[PDB]
Amino acid sequence: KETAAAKFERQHMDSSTSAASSSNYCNQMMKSRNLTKDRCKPVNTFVHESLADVQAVCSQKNVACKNGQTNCYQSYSTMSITDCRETGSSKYPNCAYKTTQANKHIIVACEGNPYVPVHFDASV
Prior knowledge:
Layout: H1 4-12, H2 25-32, E1 43-47, H3 51-55, E2 61-63, E3 72-74, E4 79-86, E5 97-104, E6 106-111, E7 116-123
Antiparallel strand pairs: 1-4, 2-3, 3-6, 4-5, 6-7
PDB class: hydrolase (nucleic acid,rna)
Keywords: hydrolase (nucleic acid, RNA)
Assembly: monomeric
């Protein structure tokens, strides 16, 4: 079945664009990446950077994850991200989201060998 590392790429990586280009980014991405297949995932962040730059975060600043785990890491640099938050009009299967673009430090949880991002924890 899909690996945690591949899942992270599918849910959170968008190396193909530098930023969201319109308010419809989230609606299109959430759908296309299959995040709304079973239900409307409430929140999701997409990172507009190279895969290598995001994998490198696993060797940056170790910080506790929001849930207390100690396998989280914070990016030394800000990164281009897009926050997707479900709107009041969202109704499965017609999931709807508000798109928010920003430049923030990301916090990911890493695992494995190679040690790569498997979860997106927060943006700060």
